[PDB]
Amino acid sequence: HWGYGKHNGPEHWHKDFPIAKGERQSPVDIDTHTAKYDPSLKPLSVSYDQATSLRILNNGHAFNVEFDDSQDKAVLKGGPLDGTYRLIQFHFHWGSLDGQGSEHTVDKKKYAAELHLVHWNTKYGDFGKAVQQPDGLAVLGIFLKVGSAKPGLQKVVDVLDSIKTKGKSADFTNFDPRGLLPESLDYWTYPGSLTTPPLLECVTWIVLKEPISVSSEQVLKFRKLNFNGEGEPEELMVDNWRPAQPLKNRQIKASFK
Ligand SMILES: NS(=O)(=O)c1ccc(O)c(NC(=O)NCCCCO)c1
Ligand SMILES: [Zn+2]
Numbered sequence: 723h724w725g726y727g728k729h730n731g732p733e734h735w736h737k738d739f740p741i742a743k744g745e746r747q748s749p750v751d752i753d754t755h756t757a758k759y760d761p762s763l764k765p766l767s768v769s770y771d772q773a774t775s776l777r778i779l780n781n782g783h784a785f786n787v788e789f790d791d792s793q794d795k796a797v798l799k800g801g802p803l804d805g806t807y808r809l810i811q812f813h814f815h816w817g818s819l820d821g822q823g824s825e826h827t828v829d830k831k832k833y834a835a836e837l838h839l840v841h842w843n844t845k846y847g848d849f850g851k852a853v854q855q856p857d858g859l860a861v862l863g864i865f866l867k868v869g870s871a872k873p874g875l876q877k878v879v880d881v882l883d884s885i886k887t888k889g890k891s892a893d894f895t896n897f898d899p900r901g902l903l904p905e906s907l908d909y910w911t912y913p914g915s916l917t918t919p920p921l922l923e924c925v926t927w928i929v930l931k932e933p934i935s936v937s938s939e940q941v942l943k944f945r946k947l948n949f950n951g952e953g954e955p956e957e958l959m960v961d962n963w964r965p966a967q968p969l970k971n972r973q974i975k976a977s978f979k
Contacts, residue, residue, distance in 0.1 A: 748914030782888035807841035871937035874901020
């Protein structure tokens with residue numbers, strides 16, 4: 723099965739998922755001088771006031787905080803998107819060291835981690851249909867740098883002891899994802915893919931310019947999770963990021979100068 727090790731990591735994925743070598747793969751390096759400011763880009767509309775978090779799950783590759791997506795409760799609109807996209811889950815990718823962990827890079831700079839708020843286009847009816855469409859998902863990507871703590875992340879950090887190993891889940895209600903957002907919603911955007919298998923080319927990526935700061939203790943607690951299931955040999959869940967992929971025939975657009 724695929725993963726992030728020496729024998730099943732990102733350089734192996736194409737053998738089971740040939741789209742790994744496709745034309746719109748993610749993540750990418752964001753060359754800030756080559757991105758083009760698009761003044762027609764609209765401000766992002768993040769409407770998370772009615773969000774209903776349900777549960778947090780260790781799936782063996784990351785942890786997902788899952789939301790009720792059966793109504794328009796937490797939606798992303800505007801920006802480059804047409805229509806309404808519903809929040810289904812968020813998760814992170816992170817490193818073994820503070821100098822690495824993000825999937826996207828900014829002028830080759832790697833951040834300590836990257837948050838992915840995953841949304842699907844309501845015109846396709848459900849997430850499974852949406853991932854089969856070139857405009858099916860919108861993933862809002864937010865970089866994490868190590869510095870001051872992020873208070874809105876702490877409820878996530880504190881529950882991780884309950885989901886240490888693959889397949890463990892915990893109730894996780896009343897979590898407000900607005901506590902994970904930076905001040906500015908300035909963003910870069912480009913067409914891309916899921917960054918884990920099945921690597922489907924269904925994502926409008928929206929990557930925020932401004933990182934959030936989290937404390938060293940917060941990211942340390944991410945690194946105590948396990949890729950393995952309970953009663954299996956312990957592999958720390960670290961470096962669960964795919965490196966930057968070729969940009970090919972794509973232009974990254976910026977909502978700001
Ligand atoms: N990193 S991402 O581009 O924001 C991303 C957003 C939504 C996704 O569905 C995936 N891929 C995925 O879930 N693959 C199957 C493993 C889960 C079952 O345990 C990746
Ligand atoms: Zn992700």
